[PDB]
Amino acid sequence: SVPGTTTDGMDPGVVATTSVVTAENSSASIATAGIGGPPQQVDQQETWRTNFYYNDVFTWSVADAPGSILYTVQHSPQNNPFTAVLSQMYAGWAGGMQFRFIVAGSGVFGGRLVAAVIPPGIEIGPGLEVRQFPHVVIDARSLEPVTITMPDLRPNMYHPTGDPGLVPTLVLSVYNNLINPFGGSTSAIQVTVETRPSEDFEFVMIRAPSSKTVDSISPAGLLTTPVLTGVGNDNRWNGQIVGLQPVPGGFSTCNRHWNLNGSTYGWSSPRFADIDHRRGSASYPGNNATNVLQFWYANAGSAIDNPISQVAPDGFPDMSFVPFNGPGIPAAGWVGFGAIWNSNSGAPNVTTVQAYELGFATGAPGNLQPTTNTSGSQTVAKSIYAVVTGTAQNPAGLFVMASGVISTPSANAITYTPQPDRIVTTPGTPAAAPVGKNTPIMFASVVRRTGDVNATAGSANGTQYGTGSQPLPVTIGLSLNNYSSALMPGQFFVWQLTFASGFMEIGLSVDGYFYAGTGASTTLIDLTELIDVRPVGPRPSKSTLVFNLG
Amino acid sequence: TSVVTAENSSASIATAGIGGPPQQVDQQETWRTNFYYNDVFTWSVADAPGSILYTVQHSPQNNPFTAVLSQMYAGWAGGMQFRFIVAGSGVFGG
């Protein structure tokens, strides 16, 4: 007679049924999955089938109204750690799964929860009324675990591994409010979810592992622990990612950006190399040719060097041109080392070596102003320091290096240079908008400045930051594979990031933007004491990502 | 009154068991035994032979009572019977 305070790893507890669990469902499922041949990996005494293994944990507080959604999960073999490994050698799967819930409360609390299975074809989100489905009610004072089973309600005969199809969804909601009769600061409890395959889960058709690999099915391995710790760079400045920058207003980034369709709207490959263009007018203001600023420009839509697009040459920064003249260093400009070369043979001009500032302008021989849309604009170079002589050749070419630094007037630092007001964008790209409490984020990096090249992180003169939209391994991996059959429009792919003290969640949309649920805060996330990164899977987009650092 | 069943009805019943037991299947119900109005269209003297006058897809919205009952069910299967009534006159042909 064991007590209920100790639970065994094979123990389901109380089995809570629902009207969707029927015998004819199981018989039809087995008899129609039989077209894939005999079932595989169905030995009932194996250790990977008999035990429950960890899936998730969530929080239930007293401020949650009835009908609030606390936890959702889509039907997949990626919810178990061992059926995700075994799916690399098979081409189909069919069957159900069991989910075990443990509520960590006491006998003094009040309140109840509700769980139901949602058939495919129904949108999951706020306004989904769970209590008018066939449901099970679970008390907050329960000591033994409660397990319900999600069956396979599908319109196919089996699920192909790349393209499963329509699946059911398990949703847990709030029946009645949580009550603490004492009242005070202690108002929250925690529930843990675990998973185990059911008795009719199987695979069917064996295949070579050197077929469609694990990097073409789900983008779970695109974001790992060393990517955000010490290996990955950003897609704008090619610098070490140190933090996360919330943007509560919104932004749109076009160049060197990839969606979940294997497509780009920009004009750059996913690599950092030289910027080369020819056939552009070069000039210099004034008459004296010693210590004279150098000017160069060319129109947009003419650079025939890229197989991708001809808006700008490969590697051009997507920043609007800040206008300047005279002996004044501009504020927050993309500057980089380079020189102007001779278009007839390729011989560079040796005396015209300086740091040139790049951007997008509207009138280059006339008055100078920044511009954002690429239609009717042009690409403009102008050196920030004094250079010797100037070539007035009409087809003259420009050669700049890959990486750049910030142009600052003084030795002190400023805010993140790439603010969302001035980002040059091709017309036709979508923007990133806040969805509820979730707001778009960028990836911060320590980038040197032209007023103090010795300055690093933690310096006494301030730290200079430059931001990008995606990490570089992510956009490299997004241009090699296709993930159309991994995320519906209106969903996020969620990763859990743990720290030494707290943990937070980030999500990736179909458009290729990253999100975090922080509201209207503008504080940088430190991202120094990060420990582990774990994938979670598809979740509804109108659900708050958990953000607590403590 | 005789009720007509489909030619593929035995395979249609068995393969829909992945959704569970069948619901609203009672052959003496009054919403199921009578014909009810669906739509109307026009046949003109200027229509060439071979022209299409009417096109409808298989759906539970081509009936006033299966459209009401589809607000509380996530799934359907089975056939549907159609009937055509010409207003007409005895002096016409075609």
């Binding site: 018989s27 087995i30 008899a31 039989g34 | 395979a11 068995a14």
Partner: peptide, 10 residues
């Protein structure tokens, strides 16, 4: 599995 084919046969 057997009940499915049995029902379709019957």
């Amino acid at each position: 599995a057997a009940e499915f084919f049995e029902g379709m046969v019957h």
